[PDB]
Design a protein around this ligand. Structure first.
Ligand code: ZN
Ligand code: ZN
Ligand code: ZN
Lengths: 7, 98
């Protein structure tokens, strides 16, 4: 699905 | 006077791993949902607890539920399977030792 990790 | 917040914790996006809900357009931390981080790519569609309860989704009739992908049958891998194939790629397509 839609995932998000700004690292 | 207050940065934008997300998730059930209502804390900002400080760089940790998150999912976006499909009912509402919010984002939720893995740690807040007690979902292990290694299951990062095993989610097909996520629905937050408040959308599965019909509190903030978009239905009205049934309630949306989080769907999980099928993990590659290699015990080491945590990547989703391909179509039909029980493996994430050809590089892992070996079922037996011989
Ligand atoms: Zn939601
Ligand atoms: Zn959170
Ligand atoms: Zn694999």
């Amino acid at each position: 699905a839609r995932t998000k990790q700004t690292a | 006077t207050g940065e934008d917040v997300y998730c059930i914790c209502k804390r900002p996006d400080y760089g940790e791993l998150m999912v976006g809900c499909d009912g509402c357009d919010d984002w939720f931390h893995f740690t807040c949902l007690h979902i292990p981080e290694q299951f990062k790519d095993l989610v097909f569609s996520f629905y937050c607890p408040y959308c599965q309860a019909g509190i903030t989704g978009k239905n009205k009739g049934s309630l949306p539920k989080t769907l999980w992908k099928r993990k590659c049958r290699i015990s080491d891998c945590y990547k989703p399977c391909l179509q039909d194939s029980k493996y994430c790629s050809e590089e892992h397509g070996r079922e037996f030792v011989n």
